[PDB]
Amino acid sequence: ESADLRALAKHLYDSYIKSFPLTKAKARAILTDKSPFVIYDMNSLMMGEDKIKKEVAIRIFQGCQFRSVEAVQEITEYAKSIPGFVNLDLNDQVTLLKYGVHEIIYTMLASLMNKDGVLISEGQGFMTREFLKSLRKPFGDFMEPKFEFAVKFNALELDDSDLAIFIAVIILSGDRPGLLNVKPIEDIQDNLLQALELQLKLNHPESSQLFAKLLQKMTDLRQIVTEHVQLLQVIKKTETDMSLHPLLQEIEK
Ligand SMILES: Cc1oc(-c2ccccc2)nc1CCC(=O)c1ccc(/C=C2\SC(=O)NC2=O)cc1
Numbered sequence: 001e002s003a004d005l006r007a008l009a010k011h012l013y014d015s016y017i018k019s020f021p022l023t024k025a026k027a028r029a030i031l032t033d034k035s036p037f038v039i040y041d042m043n044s045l046m047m048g049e050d051k052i053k054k055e056v057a058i059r060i061f062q063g064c065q066f067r068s069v070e071a072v073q074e075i076t077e078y079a080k081s082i083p084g085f086v087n088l089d090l091n092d093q094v095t096l097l098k099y100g101v102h103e104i105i106y107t108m109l110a111s112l113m114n115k116d117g118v119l120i121s122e123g124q125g126f127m128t129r130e131f132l133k134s135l136r137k138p139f140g141d142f143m144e145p146k147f148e149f150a151v152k153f154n155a156l157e158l159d160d161s162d163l164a165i166f167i168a169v170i171i172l173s174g175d176r177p178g179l180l181n182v183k184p185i186e187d188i189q190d191n192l193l194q195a196l197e198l199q200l201k202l203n204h205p206e207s208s209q210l211f212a213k214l215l216q217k218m219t220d221l222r223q224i225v226t227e228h229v230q231l232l233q234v235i236k237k238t239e240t241d242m243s244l245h246p247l248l249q250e251i252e253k
Contacts, residue, residue: 022111023111037126039126041131053121060127069245069248084187092185107163113154156214170218200214
């Protein structure tokens with residue numbers, strides 16, 4: 001019944017707010033109290049360290065990786081609040097988070113992008129898209145496909161309460177490799193999909209087939225993840241100098 005789907009939508013929105021400090025509404029408010037420092041080239045980067053809290057590219061990369069680690073923690077905390085998730089087989093829990101985390105990272109990253117750049121450091125900074133594109137060797141191409149996805153994804157005009165259900169749906173795929181019991185993951189996702197359908201039709205009544213258009217975006221996500229994993233393998237052989245966080249590259253298998 002509809003009353004149960006709304007209750008689940010409201011639960012997930014509430015946990016999303018608690019697990020993710022920098023929401024989309026806050027990011028949209030900043031992008032449009034206190035403006036960010038805009039990093040757009042070699043010198044402002046170093047003024048921004050003065051203002052806001054080793055080659056320049058790999059420096060940016062090392063911080064892009066530490067942010068992802070931070071994001072893994074928040075997604076983990078958010079996953080536990082999804083009704084039925086902690087009751088799954090512990091190995092499936094790990095498997096769902098292993099394969100689910102990058103798709104959510106890049107989904108949430110779009111909340112922080114416009115066509116020009118991306119908010120960094122809890123919104124205190126803003127790094128321009130073309131400065132990022134101007135990095136050397138293989139780094140200039142780490143962020144460009146995310147920008148391309150964000151532009152199309154952000155055109156859907158989702159708000160946080162929408163994204164809470166969508167992130168939850170991503171986590172409970174069951175499509176994932178290595179899963180021991182797919183059926184209880186699917187009953188959960190099934191109910192999440194029911195919740196997302198009512199949510200989008202109630203929130204975006206004039207937005208035709210938004211539900212379906214949203215699920216088709218789950219294809220662009222798998223692709224940028226694929227693209228990114230390969231970009232890391234290049235980094236590893238180019239940069240034997242440069243390490244990687246064990247939370248990330250153990251997920252990165
Ligand atoms: C991969 C990822 O995921 C997310 C995210 C966001 C919200 C929710 C979930 C995930 N955001 C990013 C990218 C962040 C951005 O790329 C970035 C971050 C730190 C530095 C560190 C600096 S700042 C300076 O002046 N010098 C530096 O080296 C640079 C760039």
